[PDB]
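Submission sheet (multi-component)
Chains listed below:
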Amino acid sequence: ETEDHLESLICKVGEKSACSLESNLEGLAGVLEADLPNYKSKILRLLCTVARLLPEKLTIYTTLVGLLNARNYNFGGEFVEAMIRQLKESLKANNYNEAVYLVRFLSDLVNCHVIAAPSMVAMFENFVSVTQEEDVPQVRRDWYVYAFLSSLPWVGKELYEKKDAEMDRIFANTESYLKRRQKTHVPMLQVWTADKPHPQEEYLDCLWAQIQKLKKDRWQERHILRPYLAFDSILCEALQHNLPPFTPPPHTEDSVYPMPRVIFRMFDYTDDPEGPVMPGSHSVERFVIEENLHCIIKSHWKERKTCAAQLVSYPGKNKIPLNYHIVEVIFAELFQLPAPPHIDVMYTTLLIELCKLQPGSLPQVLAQATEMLYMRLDTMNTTCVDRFINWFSHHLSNFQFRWSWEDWSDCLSQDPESPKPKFVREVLEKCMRLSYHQRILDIVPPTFSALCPSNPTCIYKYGDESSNSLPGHSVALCLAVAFKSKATNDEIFSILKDVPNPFNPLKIEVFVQTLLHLAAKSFSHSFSALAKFHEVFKTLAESDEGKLHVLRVMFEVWRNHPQMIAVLVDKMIRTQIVDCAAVANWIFSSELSRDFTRLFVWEILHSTIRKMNKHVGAQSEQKNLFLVIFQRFIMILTEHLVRCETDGTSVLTPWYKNCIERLQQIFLQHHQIIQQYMVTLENLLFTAELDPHILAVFQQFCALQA
Amino acid sequence: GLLKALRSDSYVELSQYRDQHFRGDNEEQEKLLKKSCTLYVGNLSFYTTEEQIYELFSKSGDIKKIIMGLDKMKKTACGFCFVEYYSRADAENAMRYINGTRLDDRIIRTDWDAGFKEGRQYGRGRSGGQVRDEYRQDYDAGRGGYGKL
Ligand SMILES: CN1CN([C@@H]2O[C@H](COP(=O)(O)OP(=O)(O)OP(=O)(O)OC[C@H]3O[C@@H](n4cnc5c(=O)[nH]c(N)nc54)[C@H](O)[C@@H]3O)[C@@H](O)[C@H]2O)c2nc(N)[nH]c(=O)c21
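Outcome: structure written.
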C-alpha cells in the first residue's frame, strides 16, 4: 500500500472520530502490525517523526508505540534505538527544542512499559551530571536540567516509585546547581519589573517550584491525558527494553543553546471567580497547559482559522478556564523577549479568529485582559509596550475603533510623560494612521481631546504667512514656479546659484522646503519628487553635513506627520540620498530631542538597521552603524547620569526609563547579528570604565548566551 | 523527517482569478503568480488613501511601492490597489494575516498578482470604474452609491 496512506493514518489518529480513542489506537495498532513485513522501515521513520514534531499529542503516540511493543518486542526495540539516534542527531544539529520532545517521549514510554524505569533514571543522572562539566556555557547546563525537570510531569511518579534513593540524589544535585546559577539575564527578559500582583519568574526557578509541589503531592497531577491507562492488561505484560548508557554530546565551538526565559504571568483564579478553578502559577498543570497551547500554535500558526479551532478544542482531564489560558499564552508570545516565536501581526488576527469562534465568551476575557495590561503599564518594558500599542490600535481598527476610554480617565491627571497617558497618545496616533484625524477626534470623549494627535499638516517656511526678509525667500518662491513648470535638474541648479553661502545650508533648506511642500499631496508625489530631482539631492548632500541638513529641514517640514517622516527617510536611504549613519546621528540630534521618547523615532531607527542588515557585502558599514548608535547612547546616558550626580536629582526619570530601555531594545531586536560584533564592543565601548548603569545592559545581553 | 499535514498554507494558495488581459500563456501567468511579490487588494473605499494602505500592509513587511486603482475616465480612486513588497515572504504574511481584515472599516481581499504593467491601474468597467461596480445593485456609500449602469 502507498506510504501516503500509512502517514495519513498515523497523523490523523486521535482526531475527531465517532469511535473512541482507545478503539482507534487498538485499530491502528493492528494495521501497523500487518504492514510490518513490508513497511517496517517507513513506519519507524513516521513514528519517530511525529514524536518530535507533534509534542502536543505525546501520550497519544507513546500509547500506540506501547501497544506495538507488546505485540512485537523486536519492533519496539528498533523504535527506541531509532529514537536515540534521532536524539543525538538533533543535539548534534543544535535543535535542542526538538530534542526535549524526544526526551519527553522516551520518558512517557516508561509508563507504556516500553522502557525500563532504571534506564531513564540513569540517563537523567548523566543529564544532571552536565551541570558538573567545567568551562561550558550556563545555557548548556540549563538545557539538560530543563529537559530533565520538564519530563517529570509525565514519568516523575513512576521513576520515584522504582528508584526513590537515586532520584533524591539527582534532585539534591539539581537543587545545588539551581542555587548557584547566574541570574544576570532576568532584568532584560522581564515584561514587568514589579513583583506585584504577579512576579515574572526565571523559567528554571519556576519549573523547580512546580516540580517541588508535584512531589509534595505524591506525584499526582490532574490534567495530562494518559490513553495507556486503559490498556493496563495489555501493557502491564510487555517486555520492557533497557536503554544503553547515554553520553551527552560534548560542548563544542559550534554548539548553540537556547536562551534563558522568563515566565509570562497575568492571571490567577481570582480573575475568573465563576469559572473552573484555574491551576496556580506553581502547579505542573499550568506548565503543561501552556506548553501544549504554545505547541498547538507552533503547528498551525500559518492557518489562522485552523489555529483558533485547535486552541479552542484543546482537551484535558479536568476542565480549566481555557479562554483565559488561550489569551494568556498568546500575550506570553507577543510580549516575549527578545522576540516572539512568530510575526507580530499574526497574534492580532488570531485573536480575531478566536473572537468569531467564541462570540459569547472570548471577547469579555480579551477586554478584561486589555484592562489589566493597561493598569500594569508603569513597570512594563518599553519593547513590550510598543507591541501592546501596535496590537491594541490595530485591534480597534477592526471593531470600528470602539472603546470605553473613560475607563482610563486616571491618565488625564498624571504627568504627560507617564506610561499610561503616553500609551493612550501613542495608541490614538496609531489609530489615526489607520484612519484619519477627524475620525479619532470623534471617537474619544471630550476629556481626551488633548491626548489626540495633532493634524498632520505640512509646514512651509516660505508660505503666505512668511515675510520677504527671510534668507532665500525669493529663490524659494522662484523654485515653486520652476517646479510647477516642469523644470529640469540643470534649471533647478541654476536657480539655486542665486543663494549666498553661509556645503551650502541655505541652498538645501529652500530646495527641500519647496520641493516637499509641492508634493505634500501624497506619498507617491513625494517619492516621485525625490526621484525626479535625485541629481540635485546627491549634489546638495554629498557631504555628511549635507545629508544631516536634508534630514533637519525635512523634519521641520513634516514634524506634524510622523508617518511621512518615516517613509521619506526610508526612501532617501534606499536611493542613497542619505545613508544609515546620517539617520542614526539625526535620531540623537538636538532638533529631535523633544520627540526622542516617541515611538516613530525608534521605528525609523530600527527600519534603518534592518535595511543595513539586508545589505550584503557591506559588513563594515553594518558594524559602524552599530558603533555609532551605541556611541550616542553612551554619550547621552552618561551626560544624564553625571548631571544627576551633580544637581543631586534622582536618576530614575520617565526620560531615563525610555532611553535606557531603548538601548536595551537595540540588543534585543538584533541579538543575532550584534553577536559577531560582541567582542569589539567590549573592547572599545562597553569597557569597565563605563557607568555601571550602562554597562549593566551590555552584561545582561551577554547573559543570554553565557 | 517531515509531515505533509504541517505544510498546509492555504492562505498563500492561488485563487481562481486570472487576468484576461495578461499577454501570454496561462502557464506563464501562474509561473509569475508563484514568484510574485505583488498583491492585488480589493473592496477598498473610494476614500481610502495610500497612506492608510501603507500603515496596514507594512505590518507584514517593507513596502516597495503602492499603486492606487483609478477610474479610467475621471481618474479618481475607484476601490482597489496593488501593493508590492521587496520580498515574497512578506507578501505571503500579508496573504496570511491581512487578507480578510478591516481597512477603513471594510473587509478587504488580497490576491496574488502577476506584476504591474502600465494601464493595469484602471478600472476595466464600461463606465470607467471596476467591472464589479458596473452592474452592481446595492447602495455602497464608500463605493460611490449605486452600481452605475
Ligand atoms: C478583481 N480583480 C481585479 N484585478 C485587476 O484590477 C485592475 C482593474 O480590473 P477590473 O476593473 O477589476 O476588471 P477585471 O478584468 O479584474 O474584471 P473581473 O475579474 O471583475 O471580471 C472579469 C470577467 O469575469 C467574469 N466573472 C465574474 N465573476 C466570475 C466568476 O465567479 N467566475 C467566472 N468564471 N467569471 C466571472 C465577469 O463577468 C467578467 O466578464 C486590472 O489590472 C485587473 O487585473 C485583479 N488582479 C488580481 N490579481 N486579482 C483580482 O482578483 C483582481
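Remark: Strands of chain B lie at 38-42, 63-70, 77-85, 102-103, 106-107, 109-112.
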